């Protein structure tokens, strides 16, 4: 991935509730291929099911996006996957979720 990208300042604090890698689509309901926004932690299907975040970034132009299936961070400005330390904390929280 990317060591950086110019959108990592619009990461914004985790939720002290915490992440649940198991909620559905907030629009269409799917548990299918979802990923949480991280500006504002709101969770949308992938291009491959509904494209729900695809269509979340683009009427927020909220950046970066945690896949909950491998843990993934894309930006959709770049267009590419990124990973650094200030995604080390999200990334390790929903591992815990996921994982047990
Ligand atoms: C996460 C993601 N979202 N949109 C997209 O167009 N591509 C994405 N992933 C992706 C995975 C593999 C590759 C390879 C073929 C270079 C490219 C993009
Ligand atoms: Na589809
Ligand atoms: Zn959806
Ligand atoms: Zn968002
Ligand atoms: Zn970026």
Known sequence: PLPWCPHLVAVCPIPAAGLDV???????GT????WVCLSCYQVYCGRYINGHMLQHHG?????????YID???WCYYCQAYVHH????????I????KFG
């Open 31 to 34: 548990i299918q291929e979802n």
């Open 71 to 73: 843990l993934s961070a």
């Open 59 to 67: 009427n927020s132009g909220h950046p970066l996006v945690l896949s």
């Open 85 to 92: 330390q200030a995604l080390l904390d999200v990334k390790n």
């Open 94 to 97: 929903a591992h815990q979720n």
């Open 22 to 28: 198991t909620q559905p689509c907030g629009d269409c």
